[PDB]
């Protein structure tokens, strides 16, 4: 696994959700199309794959379907995003706030670029951007 | 969300880069109740396997095929031992680890301790699964 970093923050923290995101992208999909899941939190705020999705909450709208998913506390208290991975009916769910999901985007991204040097040049202008959008 | 309760485990999944493991304990224990995580415990040295949705192992048959395990990170360990195959995630697509039946039975043994750790009403059963480990 080349997600060192990444699976020790968020196993230490309960959000194994995060972890299995990662790492089923990474394995299954291209190399682009993770530069891509990095980039989207950034610009639509969404990103979505077979078995593997993010979605920043729209806390206008309705949010009663969120009401079982471990993290729904947060949606009320700040700005959140909802994770899920595997099966579309049975998903294993998270919501976070999005600092936090940020902070997780940045060390996922300096996993990837340290295990693919190639990368590192656009890997670093995604991390510019995370840094320009989140305090 | 329920605390996580792996405090040991996660230690040395963590420094071992056997992330799988713990994620594995994570989701049951989160997803699950208390009776079906002690039948996960169980379940190792009696019928070899266990699966819930996102977290599953299976003892592997060495003397069957196993061309489907050739590209998981643990592979090269079936010739060498007795070894076991965790996956968590769906099946679509499963993030997947094999280890020794030996190295699980040393994760199995910490996690059941911090199991018994931080619900003491199981304490006699844990304590007799732990026994066979
Ligand atoms: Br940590
Ligand atoms: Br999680
Ligand atoms: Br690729
Ligand atoms: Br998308
Ligand atoms: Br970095
Ligand atoms: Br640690
Ligand atoms: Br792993
Ligand atoms: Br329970
Ligand atoms: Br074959
Ligand atoms: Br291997
Ligand atoms: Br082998
Ligand atoms: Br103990």
Redesign the interface.
């Known amino acids: 696994?080349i997600?060192?970093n990444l699976?020790?923050k968020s196993?230490?923290?309960?959000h194994?959700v995060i972890?299995?995101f990662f790492?089923?992208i990474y394995?299954?999909e291209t190399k682009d199309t993770l530069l891509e899941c990095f980039k989207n939190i950034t610009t639509t705020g969404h990103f979505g794959v077979?078995?593997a999705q993010y979605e920043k909450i729209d806390a206008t709208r309705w949010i009663g379907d969120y009401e079982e998913v471990?993290?729904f506390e947060y949606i009320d208290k700040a700005p959140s995003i909802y994770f899920s991975?595997?099966?579309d009916f049975?998903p294993?769910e998270l919501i976070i706030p999005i600092n936090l999901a940020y902070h997780y985007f940045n060390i996922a991204i300096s996993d990837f670029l340290i295990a693919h040097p190639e990368y590192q040049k656009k890997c670093k202008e995604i991390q510019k951007t995370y840094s320009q959008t989140n305090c």
């Open positions: 696994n997600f060192l699976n020790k196993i230490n923290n309960n194994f972890s299995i790492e089923t394995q299954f077979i078995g471990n993290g991975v595997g099966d049975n294993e």
